[PDB]
Every structure is written in C-alpha cells, then in structure tokens.
Amino acid sequence: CGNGMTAIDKAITKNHLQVVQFLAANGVDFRRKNSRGTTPFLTAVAENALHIAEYLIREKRQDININEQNVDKDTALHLAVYYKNLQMIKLLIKYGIDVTIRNAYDKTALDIAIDAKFSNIVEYLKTKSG
C-alpha cells in the first residue's frame, strides 16, 4: 500500500480469520518484510493475535521455517513474552521453537528475567523443556 504500511498488519490487528486465510491462500510473500523489517508472522505475533498466529503456524509449517528471522534476528518467543501472554507461548513452545540461532542486539532471557518481573513463563521454560 505504500511506505511499508501493508493493510495485513491492521487486518491482523482487527483479529479476523477469514481475510487472513484468504490472503494466505492467495500466496502472500512471507519472506517480504515491511518498513520495520519484520516478517508478517512476526507482525501478527506483535499484534497479539492468538488465532491468526495459530493458523499461520499450523497450516504453514513448510512455508515458513522455524529458524526464519527478521532483520534484527529475533524469534517470536521474546515478542510474545513482551505482552505477557501464556497460552500462545505454551503453544509456541510445544512446536519446537529454535533457540540455537544467532541474534543481533545480544540480550539474554535469564538476566532480564531476574530483574524484569515475569515468573510464570520462565518457570514453564525451566520446568519441562530441559
């Protein structure tokens, strides 16, 4: 639409599934990045769309790699924890998220967890996965 402000971002913000599924069937380029440099699924995670992200991860396993990263090289896990959500982070964990890929700004999760006041997510990380 211009200046990297694609309407799919606000469509995900509205949190409606029909148009999102129609666009996914049409073949939207997940490799293409917006002005912010974030992939459409990363944008959907940043918009806190549980059902849209769930559909994108379930029916597009082969379309988008679990190692695929944006320009700043971040996974959806940190962006999801940024909104303190729990159910969708458990869903992301049970999909086998990658934690062994590079990152740019180089801040870990344990150190920020000590002095950033989130408990349930980090305890869930330590409980089962490991």
Swiss-Prot record:
Homotetramer in membranes. It is found in: Secreted; Target cell membrane. ANK repeats lie at residues 3-32, 36-66, 72-101, 105-130. Processed by furin-like proteases at both the N- and C-termini. Presynaptic neurotoxin that causes massive release of neurotransmitters from vertebrate (but not invertebrate) nerve terminals and endocrine cells via a complex mechanism involving activation of receptor(s) and toxin insertion into the plasma membrane with subsequent pore formation. Binds to neurexin-1-alpha (NRXN1) in a calcium dependent manner, adhesion G protein-coupled receptor L1 (ADGRL1, also termed latrophilin-1 and calcium-independent receptor of latrotoxin (CIRL)), and receptor-type tyrosine-protein phosphatase S (PTPRS), also termed PTP sigma. It comes from Latrodectus tredecimguttatus (Mediterranean black widow spider). The chain holds residues 1066 to 1195 of 1401 of the full protein. This is Alpha-latrotoxin-Lt1a. Expressed in venom gland, cephalothorax, and abdomen tissues from both males and females.
